[PDB]
Enzyme design. Sequence first.
Site, short mmCIF file in Angstrom:
data_model
loop_
_atom_site.label_atom_id
_atom_site.label_comp_id
_atom_site.label_asym_id
_atom_site.label_seq_id
_atom_site.Cartn_x
_atom_site.Cartn_y
_atom_site.Cartn_z
N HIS A 1 0.82 -1.24 0.00
CA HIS A 1 0.00 0.00 0.00
C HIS A 1 0.84 1.27 0.00
CE1 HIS A 1 -0.03 0.04 4.58
NE2 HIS A 1 0.07 1.36 4.33
N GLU B 1 -0.24 -7.73 1.02
CA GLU B 1 0.48 -6.52 1.49
C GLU B 1 2.03 -6.69 1.41
OE1 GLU B 1 -1.29 -3.10 3.74
OE2 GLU B 1 -0.59 -3.49 1.68
N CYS C 1 4.99 2.24 7.82
CA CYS C 1 4.69 1.02 7.01
C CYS C 1 5.86 0.77 6.04
CB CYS C 1 3.31 1.09 6.34
SG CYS C 1 1.93 0.88 7.50
#
Lengths: 172, 172
Positions: A29, A53, A138
């Site tokens: 993402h 992911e 992230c």
Amino acid sequence: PPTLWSRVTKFGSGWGFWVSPTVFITTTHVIPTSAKEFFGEPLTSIAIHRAGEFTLFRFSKKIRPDLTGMILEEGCPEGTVCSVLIKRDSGELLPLAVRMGAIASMRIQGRLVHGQSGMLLTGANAKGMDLGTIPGDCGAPYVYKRANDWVVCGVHAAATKSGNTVVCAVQA
Amino acid sequence: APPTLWSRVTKFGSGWGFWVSPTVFITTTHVIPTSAKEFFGEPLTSIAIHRAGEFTLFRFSKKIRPDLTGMILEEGCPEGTVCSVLIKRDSGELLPLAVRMGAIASMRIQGRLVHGQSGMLLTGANAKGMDLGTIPGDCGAPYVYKRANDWVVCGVHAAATKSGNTVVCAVQ
Ligand SMILES: CCc1nnc(N)s1
């Protein structure tokens, strides 16, 4: 030698990790959706392997020839204590201990994420102290030492509002 | 950790020390140069030295750091408190290492008898070496924590075990 920290690189809306001179891993993402190149190489030159992911890039030339190749595995054994290698734009480095649990689909702030669950080992409320993850982290890698060998076993995908629970996206 | 705390961390002798106020500097006894007769342009004449084992406090008769406000220095912290050790590394990298503090302890570490507050790193399972742990050059780095609206300093880095998992804070 080059430290593990020199492998953690700002990418998209978060971070990624150099496994070798040609292999870069990140959280799906955070990758830009409008691009013709990454790290000065054209996309036609880059192999992109996506699994939920977890994304792996393989470059046709040596982008980081200063590095040796590291062991990459599909998550780690249940109960392994990993370090999440968090970089912040302040110039702070925040290695945090995480106890790794089962591979699962978990509800994280109302959304389903598939990966290896973990629990932060840095204690209760972390107040305003450098003891937990934030949304901009992230892509940060999960790593642990096994005999003489560093192992990387996935990338930071999600965390609960509370903290305590994190999800490490893994290779499939 | 706040920029004002990093501003107080000063390269000093074989390690570091920490400005508590414009007149008060704390450090680990073994990093002080043994022949040294001048500190920040001042003669020993002009400085009150308070030494308790591996803890040393320097009180100056003039304001050396007038840019700073005085903050709270306490004599260690409650058992179970999570602190940050404010470590500077090669090239403006800032490593606020998380530590769970325990009891006052007397230990033998390689060639030395050490006395202070023990703690265990919360960075990884095997913190031996520079990526997740301390190195001898980190001696003098402050131990800090957040309480309500305030930050407190409660000691300076004195030693680490061969394994790297246990550290010792020298206390006033
Ligand atoms: C290995 C770290 C652990 N924390 N809680 C446990 N029961 S194991």
